[PDB]
Chain length 146, copies 4
């Protein structure tokens, strides 16, 4: 990832204020609603049969928080997303066999939640910069396939 210094400062000025509970629940719930094939990764979590069921689901909510913590770390290490994510790459690729496309799609969902939460401060350039971050994190997650 390269961010312009104007992009960079903005991107992290905004992350400072992110509610991980709201953003994490919204992001992961919306993945499973918008892209329902993804549910077959979380059969364990229980009831995922409707949007209310997915969104209220406490394990869905709790796992989104953890997902966001990882992105929080990606953020604090944009120079080496590939090392930051090396072990998560091994988990999702070697063991979970998550399709790399789903990494992209969660990324894109995360972006549209942030437009939803960053409000007026979510300008075209701030949007461009977060799309780069979640694309780099996606590529880094899929690294054990490459």
């Amino acid at each position: 990832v390269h961010l312009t210094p104007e992009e960079k400062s903005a991107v992290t000025a905004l992350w400072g204020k992110v509610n991980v509970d709201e953003v994490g629940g919204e992001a992961l719930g919306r993945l499973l609603v918008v892209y329902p094939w993804t549910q077959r990764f979380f059969e364990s979590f229980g009831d995922l049969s409707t949007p209310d069921a997915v969104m209220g689901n406490p394990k869905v909510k709790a796992h989104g928080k953890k997902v966001l913590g990882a992105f929080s770390d990606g953020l604090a290490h944009l120079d080496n997303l590939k090392g930051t994510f090396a072990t998560l790459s091994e988990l999702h690729c070697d063991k979970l066999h998550v399709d790399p496309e789903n990494f992209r799609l969660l990324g894109n969902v995360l972006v549209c939640v942030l437009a939803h939460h960053f409000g007026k401060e979510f300008t075209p350039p701030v949007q461009a910069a977060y799309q780069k971050v979640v694309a780099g994190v996606a590529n880094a997650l899929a690294h054990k396939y490459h």
Copy 2:
């Protein structure tokens, strides 16, 4: 495209409240900022060298109006998108050689721009519903390649 009763009703309702003059222009502007290669189709519109020149460009705006009204037509014809866009497919495909992937990408941008503006009313099932709509429109635009 298949939508359920809930979905369609909230779809059109949210769509009722969209500004005709502003949204297409913000989505078309955002596409060219986030995905800067798409600028190659619009160089005759003027200066696209910075985010500010893309977003403020009057042709980008004015053209975005036509883009938004095309989607509007699509919403009115979800039954027959392929027939609805047959003429715009010839234009984009045979004459302008727009990559199918760019159609997809504008739809995703239009989805974030809705999420940005309608915050809480852009529920997960309404996002799912707009995702299905824009991808349908993208497919029908790409019909000439197929």
Copy 3:
């Protein structure tokens, strides 16, 4: 999916010399080797942990003959792709939750397999028409998500 009368004759002609006991299994196996996440759909098939294991697996080859028969059904009914895949789309989407991207991949794998077996008569236009046919197939298999 549009082919010219030139296109379909070339395509059907070539299709006639496709070894139906092996091309299917070759494409399924190459899918499984080339994009190893797809293996999560077939864990009841026995040993898949080496290229050799995969390519030898009798249930890969058994299955591929069935895959190949469904592409022949597709090739016969290009004006009725959606309808022709209605039942498989129910299976693959509502029962098996296969990601749509994987339908596209298998298609592309089937393309390189044909090229691998034919040469002489696998002209640039036949390759283009087969890509179209397989993209039509994948889009029909994903119908239930649309």
Copy 4:
């Protein structure tokens, strides 16, 4: 790009047998036939309106060789794809505005062309490795957008 010592050994021996004057022209040509939107980048090239026009265009073959040669540079330096391609990445991204997806599609075409000229030597593992390699090159060409 990681390759296994067997993949690397096999991949290099195959590339040893590639006609550097022809395979790259066949790739670029088939790209232009199969995914005909890519024709719009080649503004110098004259007539691209039929498959013969694309495949025998002198500039298609001459440019094809340059492309092939750059792929050799990558296959030689698999630990150093970002560096090997930095200058091409500027060109393609900043100056020419080539969509990443198209870098990927050119890769996939090349893979099939190889499949087309090699037969059983083109094992499932060798296909897998080339797909890795070509995706690596696509990602290093798109570096300036990231």
